[PDB]
RNA sequence: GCAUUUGCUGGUUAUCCACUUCUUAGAGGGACUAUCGGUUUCAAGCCGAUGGAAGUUUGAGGCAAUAACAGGUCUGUGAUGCCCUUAGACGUUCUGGGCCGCACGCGCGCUACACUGACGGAGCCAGCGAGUCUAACCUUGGCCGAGAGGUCUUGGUAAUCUUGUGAAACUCCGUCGUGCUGGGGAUAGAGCAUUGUAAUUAUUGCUCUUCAACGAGGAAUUCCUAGUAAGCGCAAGUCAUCAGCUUGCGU
């Protein structure tokens, strides 16, 4: 905490864009299509949208 | 006139002349009339105003500027040459001072002097340009009643501005001098010297 | 119980708020009398609602106007916007509605936007010029 | 100053190369039956009075 | 520049030819009907559709 | 029937109150009263070299009367204007702080304003009593 | 009981208003004083880049906006029901902070 | 050019000529008389405390005066 | 009603610090034809010399002008603070001097010649006749004159 | 506090109660060219008046086809083919310097040529925004100093504090008085500070002094139709320091 919401909400955006470019580069061979973050208390979670989950 | 008393004093000289007649600053729109037909319905002195500051939309139609009162059309033409644009609160002071000075030199109604100046200094026969090829000859045409009022205010305020420029006499006085010398056809005014010069050029080109 | 109407008047950023209650006849703007609204050449602009319908109508009401926003000329157009609406809306509620039309007829026939605020609003600036329509000078060689 | 007045009966249409000259027909307002066609410089509406320094040219449209 | 386009015009004719004895000659109670007898996405379009419907009916009951 | 300074015109009150402060003669004008430019945007010192300081003291006291409390930083923004920096465009420049601080200290020593909670300086018990008496006299000047 | 405050911040109008609606719906399911949703002014965060890489072309400008909507609800509740209502209404895109006093 | 100090030959010219002036002002003095401008702005005060001309409006940038009688 | 009828004591152009001072303009701005005083130095020295500022220069009887030129030639002794002073800790003395009418062109010449003979970069630019401060030259400054 | 008669102007961080006109923002309503009149082949439409907050497509944008250009960009990219270089390197890094150097020509601009003005007091009015946790951001208030600035504290991760951003033009009163003058402030001298490891080839701010051209600009040529042009400042970007630039905003 101790960060203004203007810098907080922007930092959530750049964090998402860094994650998305990571998985395009990493899971290129598994048909990756997107992510979404769910910022919750007690273990914020990340979902990967990729066709071959048996490979991911 | 049975003055009314109330918790705010509202001084005695205010309501005495304004509850019954809505004058100018202190001047009357009664007994003022456009002596020149073809300028009635273009010189507007029929609905009186208190000051010449009306935040009115007159530009949104073709002929709506004719319904603007001509005193405000003179304060509007004073805010000119750049350093005075959008300085209407200075232009009302100049006009308020002008109508006081006009009354002093000639004891008639200063509103009537303005209308006399407008009715005289509008050109009556103007010249247009015919290009063809080459010499670009000129052609003499008529002039609209609206343009006569439009150009008379132009010539008067240009002449007052140029006379008062590098001069110790203020803009209020030179505007007063120009309006008085144009109410009669004195030809000591900038506008009258301009008006007959435009007319004699068209006379050659008719 | 103390019959009172509050209303507002507007010009271009300015918002005058009027508090029209029944009383003795003080007409005060920002705590100061109406005789002190000082661009001093537009001092009569706060005076048309007091003179178009006559000064007698204000002898039993109290006016208290506060202005914010706008400029020196825009605010002066905002008190008169609120005075006119503040008297015709007093008459709609606490005296005969026949009298309201007679004052509404007076203000509208002399419409310097005393009752209806004008819809002229600033146009946004664009790129490539210093104004909404004005463009930078181009050089061509 | 033999100034004669007239008033517009019908606005015909613009003329000139730049179109800054309006062609109108005027009734003389001293004798109604005389209608001459002339052309004006500024903006003219229907049924407004004019001033004729000399009412003889009956000018045609400019180019 | 008040020309309606072939979205407003073609829809209004189709809405008259099957709902003629329900539509009035009044706009204010025609646009309330267009929310029930039609599915139109935006409020701005159904005011244009109901307005041209009201204009067409004024020239249906004439001829 | 009872008047405040809000019923008096501002220019006509400040001139009348500035004369009263000089007639009393107890304000402790500083020794630098005739050297200073009063802003860094100004070009020349105040023209009324004998009584320009009494006009600031009268203007500041009315300002504190009309507001809740002000400090020397709000007075510098108020009394400062545009600066001509020659070939470059004009900009707002705050006024001189030493003058405003000396004015406020003089007013506290004459006991017309006082130090305030929430900072700044509010007008005092005698401040309202004394501003309103000259406010009363200014109405009744007209014979 | 204790005085609590719940502050909501998001960039999505539709995803935020229903969360505040669930908050107030759980607030008068078992009744307690509301001090309901006070919407703060929306914040528009503007970034004005030029349009391009390298400066060839007409000097065209873009502006990008992010809109921050903020809402706070000032409740009071027993200590037990605080945790459950703060944990049930969790939705992606909406940031919820709860101030103890 | 323009005189800035009264010399008692201009002073009597003040007293016997401004009653003939139906419009009298700062620029009026400097044009028909040859006076220093700032001397005129003092003269119009002096011609008021004893009535020879009367004020009809007093603005800081423009003074307008007429003959008293 | 400030009309005064003094006729004889007025004086036309007069010499102070070897400079013809115009006699019929206000004293503060009349002194400013001296090279070394300006609109704000002369105002302060008139205030210190206790002169009614409304007077023309054709007034100011000779002991008042003597007082004024006493203030100009010796400011620090008459309570003028050291930040009005034209030279402060000057270049050799460490004293505080206000340079006056004929000394202004000479002390400037002294300073330019002092930093020319040392071959500092400012001196060489002055000798060449170029803009000595760090300002562009490619487009402005034409017509050397 | 003043009047005193019951009133007027205030203060009181939550004293309490009540309300949402003004403010905020969700869901909505609202305009459709509505009503009337006139025109045309009698259609699509157009024009005038009334009503209305709003009648130009209500104002302004965003978005935005098919085909193209040997348009710009390899100096945005750990986008990239081919060529070159790859250890005394064309990699990288460090000290200095340069990009700013001036016979001169051009483009965008800023300030001006003054009295519708300059100066000095006095009045006093916005909107868009930005702002610091393991880092020093926006800074109120007190004190010091002519000023720039310093110092002791405080509020603020912000509809809460800076901030009512008490902006500037503007307005009132006075000084000037047609004089390149109190217009203009280029060029230059001396000092005091601030940012920075570092200010010389002046970073910038301030104080005193110096007082240039410029008297309304030839042929040419730009932008603009209403809250527009023009005047006037303010915030943000760049930033440690530097705005005569731009992006917006209001007056």
UniProtKB/Swiss-Prot annotation, chain C:
Assigned GO CC terms: 90S preribosome; cytosol; cytosolic small ribosomal subunit
Modified residues (Phosphoserine): 32, 59, 74
Classification via InterPro entries: Ribosomal_Su5_D2-typ_SF (IPR020568), Ribosomal_uS9 (IPR000754), Ribosomal_uS9_CS (IPR020574), Ribsml_uS5_D2-typ_fold_subgr (IPR014721)
Record GO biological process: maturation of SSU-rRNA from tricistronic rRNA transcript (SSU-rRNA, 5.8S rRNA, LSU-rRNA); translational initiation
Entry keyword Isomerase: no
Positions bearing Phosphothreonine: 68
Compartments (UniProt record): Cytoplasm
Presence of keyword Phosphoprotein: yes
Gene3D superfamilies according to UniProt: 3.30.230.10
Crosslink (Glycyl lysine isopeptide (Lys-Gly) (interchain with G-Cter in ubiquitin)) position: 28, 45, 57
Domain of life: Eukaryota
Sequence ranges of Basic residues compositional bias: 132-141
Region Disordered: start-end pairs: 121-141
Keywords: Acetylation, Cytoplasm, Isopeptide bond, Phosphoprotein, Ribonucleoprotein, Ribosomal protein, Ubl conjugation
Pfam families: Ribosomal_S9
GO MF term list: RNA binding; structural constituent of ribosome
Subunit structure and binding partners: Component of the small ribosomal subunit (SSU). Mature yeast ribosomes consist of a small (40S) and a large (60S) subunit. The 40S small subunit contains 1 molecule of ribosomal RNA (18S rRNA) and 33 different proteins (encoded by 57 genes). The large 60S subunit contains 3 rRNA molecules (25S, 5.8S and 5S rRNA) and 46 different proteins (encoded by 81 genes).
Extra facts: Present with 33800 molecules/cell in log phase SD medium. There are 2 genes for uS9 in yeast.
PANTHER family xrefs: RIBOSOMAL PROTEIN S16, RIBOSOMAL PROTEIN S9
Family as reported in the entry's similarity comment: Belongs to the universal ribosomal protein uS9 family.
Protein's name according to its UniProt entry: Small ribosomal subunit protein uS9A
Organism, as annotated: Saccharomyces cerevisiae (strain ATCC 204508 / S288c)
Gene name, Swiss-Prot/TrEMBL: RPS16A
Swiss-Prot record, chain E:
Note: Present with 30900 molecules/cell in log phase SD medium. There are 2 genes for eS17 in yeast.
Cellular location(s): Cytoplasm
Top-level taxon of the source organism: Eukaryota
Transmembrane segments: none
Function, as annotated: Component of the ribosome, a large ribonucleoprotein complex responsible for the synthesis of proteins in the cell. The small ribosomal subunit (SSU) binds messenger RNAs (mRNAs) and translates the encoded message by selecting cognate aminoacyl-transfer RNA (tRNA) molecules. The large subunit (LSU) contains the ribosomal catalytic site termed the peptidyl transferase center (PTC), which catalyzes the formation of peptide bonds, thereby polymerizing the amino acids delivered by tRNAs into a polypeptide chain.
Protein name listed in UniProt: Small ribosomal subunit protein eS17A
Oligomeric and partner information: Component of the small ribosomal subunit (SSU). Mature yeast ribosomes consist of a small (40S) and a large (60S) subunit. The 40S small subunit contains 1 molecule of ribosomal RNA (18S rRNA) and 33 different proteins (encoded by 57 genes). The large 60S subunit contains 3 rRNA molecules (25S, 5.8S and 5S rRNA) and 46 different proteins (encoded by 81 genes).
Family (UniProt): Belongs to the eukaryotic ribosomal protein eS17 family.
From Swiss-Prot, chain F:
Biological process annotations from GO: ribosomal small subunit assembly; ribosomal small subunit biogenesis; ribosomal subunit export from nucleus; translation
Organism: Saccharomyces cerevisiae (strain ATCC 204508 / S288c)
Organism ancestry: Eukaryota, Fungi, Dikarya, Ascomycota, Saccharomycotina
Keyword Heme assigned: no
Anything else known: Present with 29000 molecules/cell in log phase SD medium.
Gene Ontology CC, one term: cytosol
PANTHER family in the cross-refs: 40S RIBOSOMAL PROTEIN S19
A Pfam family matched in the record: Ribosomal_S19e
Protein name, entry field: Small ribosomal subunit protein eS19A
Lineage: superkingdom: Eukaryota
InterPro entries, sorted: Ribosomal_eS19, Ribosomal_eS19_CS, WH-like_DNA-bd_sf, WH_DNA-bd_sf
Disulphide bridges: none
Keywords in alphabetical order: Cytoplasm, Ribonucleoprotein, Ribosomal protein, Ribosome biogenesis
UniProt cross-references to Gene3D superfamilies, sorted A to Z: Winged helix-like DNA-binding domain superfamily/Winged helix DNA-binding domain
Gene ablation phenotype (knockout): Disruption of a single RPS19 gene reduces cell growth; a double disruption is lethal. Depletion experiments show the proteins are required for correct maturation of precursor rRNA to generate the 18S small rRNA. A specific site between the 18S and 5.8S precursors (site A2 in ETS1) is not cleaved in disruption mutants. Partially assembled ribosomes are retained in the nucleolus rather than being exported to the cytoplasm. All effects are exacerbated in the double disruption. Increases association of NOC4 with 20S/21S pre-rRNA, decreases association of ENP1, TSR1 and RIO2 with 20S/21S pre-rRNA.
UniProtKB/Swiss-Prot annotation, chain I:
Keyword Cell membrane in record: no
Domain of life: Eukaryota
InterPro entries named among the record's database cross-references: Rbsml_uS13_C, Ribosomal_uS13, Ribosomal_uS13-like_H2TH, Ribosomal_uS13_CS
Keyword RNA-binding listed: yes
Gene Ontology MF: a single term: structural constituent of ribosome
PTM comment: N-terminally acetylated by acetyltransferase NatA.
GO BP term (any one): ribosomal subunit export from nucleus
Primary localization class, coarse: cytoplasm
Keywords, comma-separated and alphabetical: Acetylation, Cytoplasm, Isopeptide bond, Methylation, Ribonucleoprotein, Ribosomal protein, RNA-binding, rRNA-binding, Ubl conjugation
Gene3D superfamilies: 1.10.8.50, 30s ribosomal protein s13, domain 2
Residues found modified as N6-methyllysine: 47
A GO CC term attached to the entry: small ribosomal subunit
Modified residues (N-acetylserine): 1
Cross-link (Glycyl lysine isopeptide (Lys-Gly) (interchain with G-Cter in ubiquitin)), chain numbering: 35, 48, 79, 95
Subcellular location: Cytoplasm
Family: Belongs to the universal ribosomal protein uS13 family.
Function: Component of the ribosome, a large ribonucleoprotein complex responsible for the synthesis of proteins in the cell. The small ribosomal subunit (SSU) binds messenger RNAs (mRNAs) and translates the encoded message by selecting cognate aminoacyl-transfer RNA (tRNA) molecules. The large subunit (LSU) contains the ribosomal catalytic site termed the peptidyl transferase center (PTC), which catalyzes the formation of peptide bonds, thereby polymerizing the amino acids delivered by tRNAs into a polypeptide chain.
Family annotation (HAMAP family): Ribosomal_uS13
Further remarks about this protein from its record: Present with 48100 molecules/cell in log phase SD medium.
The name this protein goes by in its record: Small ribosomal subunit protein uS13A
Species: Saccharomyces cerevisiae (strain ATCC 204508 / S288c) (Baker's yeast)
């Amino acid at each position: 905490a101790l960060i203004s919401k203007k810098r907080k909400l922007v930092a959530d955006g750049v964090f998402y864009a860094e994650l998305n470019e990571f998985f395009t580069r990493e899971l290129a061979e598994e048909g990756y299509s997107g992510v979404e973050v769910r910022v919750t208390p007690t273990k914020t979670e990340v979902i990967i949208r990729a066709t071959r989950t048996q490979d991911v | 006139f049975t003055p009314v008393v109330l918790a705010t004093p509202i001084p005695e000289e205010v309501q005495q002349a304004q509850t019954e007649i809505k004058l100018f600053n202190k001047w009357s729109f009664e007994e003022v009339e456009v002596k020149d037909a073809s300028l009635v319905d273009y010189v507007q002195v029929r609905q009186p105003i208190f000051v010449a500051h009306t935040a009115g939309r007159y530009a949104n139609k073709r002929f709506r500027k004719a319904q603007c009162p001509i005193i405000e059309r003179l304060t509007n033409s004073l805010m000119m040459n750049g350093r005075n644009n959008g300085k209407k609160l200075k232009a009302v002071r100049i006009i308020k001072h002008t109508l006081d000075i006009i009354n002093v030199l000639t004891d008639q109604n200063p509103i009537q002097v303005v209308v006399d100046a407008i009715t005289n200094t509008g050109p009556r026969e103007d010249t247009t340009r015919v290009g063809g090829g080459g010499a670009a000859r000129r052609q003499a045409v008529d002039v609209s009643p609206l343009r006569r009022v439009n150009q008379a205010i132009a010539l008067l305020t240009i002449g007052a501005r140029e006379a008062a420029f590098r001069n110790i006499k203020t803009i209020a006085e030179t505007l007063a001098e120009e309006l008085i010398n144009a109410a009669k056809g004195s030809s000591t005014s900038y506008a009258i010297k301009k008006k007959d010069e435009l007319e004699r050029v068209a006379k050659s080109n008719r | 119980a103390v019959p009172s109407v509050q209303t507002f008047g507007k010009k271009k950023s300015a918002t005058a708020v009027a508090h029209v209650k029944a009383g003795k006849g003080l007409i005060k703007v920002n705590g100061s009398p109406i005789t002190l609204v000082e661009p001093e050449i537009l001092r009569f602009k706060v005076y048309e609602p007091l003179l178009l319908v006559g000064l007698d109508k204000f002898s039993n009401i109290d006016i208290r106007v506060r202005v914010t926003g706008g400029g020196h000329v825009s605010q002066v157009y905002a008190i008169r916007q609120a005075i006119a609406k503040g008297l015709v809306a007093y008459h709609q509620k606490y005296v005969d509605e026949q009298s309201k039309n007679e004052l509404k007829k007076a203000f509208t026939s002399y419409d310097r936007t005393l009752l209806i605020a004008d819809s002229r609003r600033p146009e946004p600036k664009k790129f490539g010029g210093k104004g909404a329509r004005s463009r930078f000078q181009k050089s061509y060689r | 100053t033999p100034v004669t007045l007239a008033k517009v009966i019908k606005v015909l249409g613009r003329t000139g190369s730049r179109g800054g000259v309006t062609q109108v027909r005027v009734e003389f307002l001293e004798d109604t039956s005389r209608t001459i066609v002339r052309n004006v410089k500024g903006p003219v509406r229907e049924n407004d009075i004019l001033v004729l320094m000399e009412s003889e040219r009956e000018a045609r449209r400019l180019r | 520049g008040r020309v309606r386009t072939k979205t407003v015009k073609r829809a209004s004719k189709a809405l008259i030819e099957r709902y003629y004895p329900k539509l009035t000659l009044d706009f204010q109670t025609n646009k309330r009907l267009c929310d029930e007898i039609a599915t139109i996405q935006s409020k701005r379009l159904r005011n244009k559709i109901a307005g041209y419907t009201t204009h067409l009916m004024k020239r249906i009951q004439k001829g | 029937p009872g008047v405040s300074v809000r019923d008096v015109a501002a220019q006509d009150f400040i001139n009348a109150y500035a004369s009263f402060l000089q007639r009393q003669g107890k304000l402790e004008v500083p020794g630098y009263v005739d050297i200073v430019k009063t802003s860094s945007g100004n070009e020349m010192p105040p023209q009324d070299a004998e009584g320009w300081f009494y006009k600031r003291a009268a203007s500041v006291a009315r300002h504190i009367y009309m507001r809740k409390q002000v400090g020397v930083g709000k007075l510098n923004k108020l009394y400062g204007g545009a600066k001509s920096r020659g070939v470059r465009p004009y900009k707002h420049i705050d006024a001189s702080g030493s003058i405003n601080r000396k004015v406020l200290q003089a007013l506290e020593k004459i006991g017309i304003v006082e130090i305030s909670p929430k900072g700044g300086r509010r007008i005092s018990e005698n401040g309202q009593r004394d501003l309103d008496r000259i406010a009363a006299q200014t109405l009744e000047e007209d014979e | 009981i204790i005085k609590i405050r719940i502050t909501l911040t998001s960039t999505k109008v539709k995803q935020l208003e229903n969360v505040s609606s669930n908050i107030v719906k759980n607030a008068e399911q078992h009744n307690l004083v509301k001090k309901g949703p006070v919407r703060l002014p929306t914040k528009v965060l503007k970034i004005s880049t030029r349009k391009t890489p390298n400066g060839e072309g007409s000097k065209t400008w873009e502006t990008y906006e992010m809109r921050i909507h903020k809402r706070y609800i000032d409740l009071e509740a027993p200590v037990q029901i605080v945790k459950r209502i703060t944990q049930i209404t969790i939705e992606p895109g909406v940031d919820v902070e709860v101030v103890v006093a | 050019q323009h005189a800035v100090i009264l010399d008692q030959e201009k002073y009597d010219r003040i007293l016997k000529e401004v009653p003939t002036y139906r419009y009298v002002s700062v620029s009026v003095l400097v044009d028909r008389l040859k006076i220093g401008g700032s001397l005129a702005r003092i003269a119009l005060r002096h011609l008021e405390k004893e009535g020879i001309i009367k004020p009809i409006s007093k603005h800081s940038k423009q003074a307008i005066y007429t003959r008293a009688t | 009603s400030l009309v005064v009828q003094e006729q004889g004591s007025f004086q036309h152009i007069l010499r102070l610090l070897n400079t013809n001072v115009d006699g019929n303009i206000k004293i503060v701005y009349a002194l400013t034809t001296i090279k070394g005083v300006g609109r704000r130095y002369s105002n302060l020295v008139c205030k210190k010399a206790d002169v009614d500022l409304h007077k023309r220069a054709g007034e100011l009887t000779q002991e008042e002008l003597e007082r004024i030129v006493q203030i100009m030639q010796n400011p620090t002794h008459y309570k003028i603070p050291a930040w009005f002073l034209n030279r402060q800790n000057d270049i050799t003395d460490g004293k505080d001097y206000h340079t006056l009418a004929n000394n202004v062109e000479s002390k400037l010449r002294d300073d330019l010649e002092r930093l020319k003979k040392i071959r500092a970069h400012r001196g060489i630019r002055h000798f060449w006749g170029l803009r000595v401060r760090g300002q562009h030259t490619k487009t402005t400054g034409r017509r050397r004159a």
